[PDB]
Amino acid sequence: SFSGYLKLTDNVYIKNADIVEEAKKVKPTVVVNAANVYLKHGGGVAGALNKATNNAMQVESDDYIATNGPLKVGGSCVLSGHNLAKHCLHVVGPNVNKGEDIQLLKSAYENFNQHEVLLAPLLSAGIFGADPIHSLRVCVDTVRTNVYLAVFDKNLYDKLVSSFL
DSSP codes, 41-89 = --SHHHHHHHHHTTTHHHHHHHHHHHHH-PPPTT-EEEEE-TTT-SEEE
Residue type, 70: P
Beta-bridge partners for 147: 12, 118
Question: What is the rounded end-to-end Cα distance, in angstroms, of the chain?
Answer: 26
Resolution given for this structure, in angstroms: 1.1
Torsions phi, psi for 34 (to 5 deg): -80, 80
Q: Are 62 and 44 in contact (CB under 8 A)?
A: no
How many other CB atoms are there within 10 angstroms of residue 70's CB atom? 14
Integer Cα distance of 138 and 119 in angstroms: 16
Q: Are 88 and 118 in contact (CB under 8 A)?
A: no
Write a three-state SS string for 18-31. Answer: CHHHHHHHHCCCEE
Q: Are 104 and 73 in contact (CB under 8 A)?
A: yes
By what method was this entry solved?
X-ray
Integer Cα distance of 51 and 59 in angstroms: 11
Write the CB contacts of 128 (distance below 8 Å, at least 6 apart in sequence).
34, 44, 93, 94, 95, 96, 97
Q: Which H or E run contains 141? A: helix 132-142
Integer Cα distance of 52 and 149 in angstroms: 19
Task: Using alpha carbons, list the distances in angstroms from residue 76 to 27, 50, 73, 87.
Answer: 20, 16, 8, 12
Integer Cα distance of 101 and 86 in angstroms: 31
Closest CA to 130 of 91, 97, 161, 160: 97
Q: Are 120 and 112 in contact (CB under 8 A)?
A: yes
Residue type, 148: Y
Write the CB contacts of 157 (distance below 8 Å, at least 6 apart in sequence).
14, 15, 16, 151
Closest CA to 52 of 81, 74, 78, 26: 81
Closest CA to 31 of 43, 46, 11: 46
Exposed/middle/buried for residue 161 (C-beta within 10 Å: 0-12, 13-18, 19+): middle
